[PDB]
Amino acid sequence: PLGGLSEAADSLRELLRLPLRYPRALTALGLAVPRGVLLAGPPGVGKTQLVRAVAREAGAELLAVSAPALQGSRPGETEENVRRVFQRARELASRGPSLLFLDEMDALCPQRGSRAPESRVVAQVLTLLDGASGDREVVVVGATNRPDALDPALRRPGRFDREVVIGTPTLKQRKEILQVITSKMPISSHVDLGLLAEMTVGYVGADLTALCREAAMHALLHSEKNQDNPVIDEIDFLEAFKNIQPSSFDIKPVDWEEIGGLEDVKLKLKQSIEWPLKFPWEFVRMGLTQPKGVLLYGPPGCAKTTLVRALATSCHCSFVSVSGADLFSPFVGDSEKVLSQIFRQARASTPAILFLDEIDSILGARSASKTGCDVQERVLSVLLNELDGVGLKTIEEVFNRSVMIIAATNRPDVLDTALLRPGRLDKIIYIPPPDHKGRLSILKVCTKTMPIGPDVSLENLAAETCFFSGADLRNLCTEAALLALQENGLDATTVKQEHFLKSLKTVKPSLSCKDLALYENLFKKEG
Amino acid sequence: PLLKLLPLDARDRGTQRCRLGPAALHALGARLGSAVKISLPDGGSCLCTAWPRRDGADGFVQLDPLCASPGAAVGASRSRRSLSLNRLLLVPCPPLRRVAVWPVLRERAGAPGARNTAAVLEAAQELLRNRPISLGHVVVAPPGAPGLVAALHIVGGTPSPDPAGLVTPRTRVSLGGEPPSEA
């Protein structure tokens, strides 16, 4: 059946019933819609089975011809085979409910800059589709892995523009697909499928299929007598985990109780970000402003991402974050398209919240290396271009869904001033390291589940934890709990007061109290 | 008894007939060119024309599945399985006044539409000459056959051709055109 894919399945079934379910309206209003889609993603148990499922969801000829199964040796037989299959498609358009499909067109579609015959292939397939423009009830589903793997001159407007990626393997989808797979093969009755699922980050569905496959393989090769009713034990699944690697590739929920200190910044973020969403009509009856961009900064090491996620939690709004590791792929020209796609999903779930983490990593030095920083400034340009795209309308019923972008970092100069300019971002808030009281509160809240006892008094550590960080205190109490455990051994529930001090004199913090002043002064001069 | 099932050399492979040794021919006593309903051991009966073995041999049965059972065609080749004589039957053949068919067409890819029915009707009337067919059966066309037709799924039979029936040169062939029970 369908495994962890029904979301994109439903979305695409909508986008395709739109032309298919009502053909007697376009020319009725001169409204030729897009005709041709691109399913990009790791194929196998998903994409093609999905297109099957959806053509069924409507009723359509599953003409599932794998495109690389029609290659020709001499120029002329190839394009005529294309004529053949597209003629099948057209005489199908003479029929009722239907759909044309193919897969792995990438082999049949290199990119531009290549030799001559690719020109012939692409021009003649463009011919066939531009002829089918007049057909009745058929379209083309180019099924490939990565959209870039295709010819650009075929993704034009009025051409293969509706481009959708297969799903990304989320945990819920992981469990769904494991269940779907095992629905036809006997696995033991003691499987926490979600366990292996979370063990399989990056592993797409088909990878999981393969995992279970080789698992059962060594199950058979390991079971001896009852080789007919395999109780495929999860130990062999671990065995499989070993003998496998995944491909290339903040759902974690949080709460405000998990954080304390710097209540001013919390109240601020509550004021100028979430409250527009929770009181939009109130805002506009006030009509004060919608600050579209917000920037945050302090000393690096206060786990600011946690506060960002807490904000993302207290609103229920669709939240998406963007990191340099999520960004720094080995493809040049990919960062721009990535951030574009992210903002595209933003405007897709138009009430969205987007967040750029460590923009220093997202955008490095401006001109430190004065010759090899071209694509970074190109990302800068495309970013600036997409930024002022958030300019909405409806000045002084109140429907206006914008995406208030927030970012945060600690290296101010490394950024570009035009971003900070009040044309794009006009709110920059300071995240100073906690005071004595903030350290007290952070200790209390990070300790509220640690092994504690009778001799605890956090105020003394507070007096001694000046010029620390939150992560500093957290690592401190963790290693101290380690000491407490190993001292009295495993079987122990007691507590201490001093091994914390010892860990203190082991772990030395950002004691300077000067670099914070540097960042603060620089930011304050930067806005 | 029990009979082996050799493959089929080219000459026969063209036409419909099925060869057989004079032993079994004496058994069921059919003169020649008769009909023999054959039930494949893989589900789906078949119908063929009788013709004696070339060399008075014994116990072997080469056959060709022209008048097949739907989809069960290829199940006739590529085997070494036996075939018990009881799996064959002599079937009476009436002259079958009028018939009615639903044809596929050959993929003359490049010109479909309105299909000049005189053409397809002539070709079908050709491919059905003097053959015995039994209702509920495909009739493939031989390779490199002329014309356009490539299938004659058999539906309408006037004197109820349930066992089988012989289409004669003076039999109406109504190109009815009702694809039956497509599932």
Annotate A147-174 with three-state secondary structure.
Answer: HHHCCHHHCCCCCCCEEEECCCCCHHHH
Nearest-angstrom CA–CA distance, A405 and A116: 46
Which residue in chain B has the smallest CA separation from A91?
A: B112
Q: What are A421's two structure tokens?
A: 């300019």
Q: Name, in order, each residue with C-beta under 8 angstroms of A85's C-beta and a sequence gap of 6 or more.
A: A65, A70, A102
Please answer whether residues A496 and A447 qualify as being in contact, where contact means their C-beta atoms are separated by less than 8 angstroms. no
How many degrees, rounded to 5, is the angle at CA A293 between CA A398 and CA A520? Answer: 145
- Sheet containing strand B153-157, edge to edge, reads B153-157, B98-102, B172-174
Q: Is A370 helix (H, G, I), strand (E, B) or coil?
A: coil
Nearest-angstrom CA–CA distance, B4 and A524: 97
Do the chains contact at B110 and A87, CB–CB below 8 Å?
Answer: yes
Q: What are B1's two structure tokens?
A: 């008894």
Please answer whether residues B179 and B102 qualify as being in contact, where contact means their C-beta atoms are separated by less than 8 angstroms. yes
Nearest to A209 by CA among A248, A231, A233, A237: A237
- A352-357 and A405-409: which strand pairing? parallel
Q: What are A410's two structure tokens?
A: 């600690």
Nearest-angstrom CA–CA distance, A284 and A299: 35
Nearest-angstrom CA–CA distance, A74 and A83: 15
Look up residue A247 and give its amino acid: S
- CA-to-CA separations, A246 to A169, A217, A319, A421, in angstroms, rounded: 12, 19, 27, 43
Q: What are A95's two structure tokens?
A: 């029929």
A81 in contact with B at a CB cutoff of 8 Å?
Answer: no
Nearest-angstrom CA–CA distance, A507 and A475: 9
Helix axes A470-488, A499-506, angle to 10 degrees: 130
Chain A positions in Cβ-Cβ contact with residue B109 (cut-off 8 Å): 84, 87-88
Please answer whether residues A263 and A429 qualify as being in contact, where contact means their C-beta atoms are separated by less than 8 angstroms. no
Greatest distance between any 2 Cα atoms in chain A: 87
Nearest-angstrom CA–CA distance, A215 and B182: 41
Q: Where are the beta strands (DSSP E) in A8-148?
A: 37-40, 65-66, 102-103, 141-144
Q: Is A294 helix (H, G, I), strand (E, B) or coil?
A: strand
Nearest to B173 by CA among B114, B128, B117: B128
Please answer whether residues A68 and A12 qualify as being in contact, where contact means their C-beta atoms are separated by less than 8 angstroms. no
Look up residue A490 and give its amino acid: L
Please list the residues that pair with A488 across neighbouring strands: none
DSSP assignments along A190-211, one per residue: ---HHHHHHHTTT--HHHHHHH
Q: What are phi and psi of A367, to 5 degrees?
A: -140, 45
Nearest-angstrom CA–CA distance, B138 and B102: 10
Nearest-angstrom CA–CA distance, A299 and B79: 80
Please answer whether residues A407 and A355 qualify as being in contact, where contact means their C-beta atoms are separated by less than 8 angstroms. yes
Please answer whether residues A479 and A499 qualify as being in contact, where contact means their C-beta atoms are separated by less than 8 angstroms. no
Q: What are phi and psi of A133, to 5 degrees?
A: -45, -35
Do the chains contact at A84 and B112, CB–CB below 8 Å?
Answer: no
* Resolution, Å (one decimal): 4.5
Nearest-angstrom CA–CA distance, B13 and B76: 12
Give the count of Cβ contacts less than 8 A between chain A and B.
5
Task: Give me the helices (H) in A399-514, please.
Answer: 417-420, 436-447, 458-464, 470-488, 499-506
Do the chains contact at B112 and A91, CB–CB below 8 Å?
Answer: yes
3-state secondary structure A299-320: CCCCCHHHHHHHHHHCCCCEEE
The response to whether A186 counts as a known ligand-binding position is no
Residues 87-116, chain A: which have Cβ within 8 Å of B? 87-88, 91
Nearest to A386 by CA among A450, A329, A341: A341
Please answer whether residues A17 and A58 qualify as being in contact, where contact means their C-beta atoms are separated by less than 8 angstroms. yes
How many degrees, rounded to 5, is the angle at CA A9 between CA A4 and CA A10? Answer: 115
Please answer whether residues B115 and B46 qualify as being in contact, where contact means their C-beta atoms are separated by less than 8 angstroms. no
Task: Give me the helices (H) in A246-333, please.
Answer: 263-269, 275-278, 280-286, 304-313
Q: What are A504's two structure tokens?
A: 């203190």
Please list the residues that pair with A354 across neighbouring strands: A320
Give the minimum alpha-carbon distance from B119 to chain A in angstroms, rounded to a whole number: 20
The response to whether A47 counts as a known ligand-binding position is yes
Do the chains contact at A88 and B109, CB–CB below 8 Å?
Answer: yes
Q: A222-252: b or e for each residue (b if 16 or more CB lie within 10 Å)? A: ebeeeeeebebbbebbebbbeeeeeeeebee
| Radius of gyration in angstroms for the set of CA atoms belonging to chain A, rounded to a whole number | 29
Q: What are A381's two structure tokens?
A: 């340009």
DSSP assignments along B95-150, one per residue: --SEEEEE--B---TT--SSTTHHHHHHHHHHHTSS-EE-SS--BPPPTT-SSSB-
- Reported as type and span, the H/E element at residue A212 is helix A205-222
Look up residue A431 and give its amino acid: I
Please answer whether residues A400 and A283 qualify as being in contact, where contact means their C-beta atoms are separated by less than 8 angstroms. no
Nearest-angstrom CA–CA distance, A446 and A257: 10
The 10 Å Cβ neighbour count of residue B36 is 23
Give the minimum alpha-carbon distance from B41 to chain A in angstroms, rounded to a whole number: 28
- A352-357 and A318-322: which strand pairing? parallel
Q: What are A225's two structure tokens?
A: 């007598």
- Reported as type and span, the H/E element at residue A86 is helix A77-93
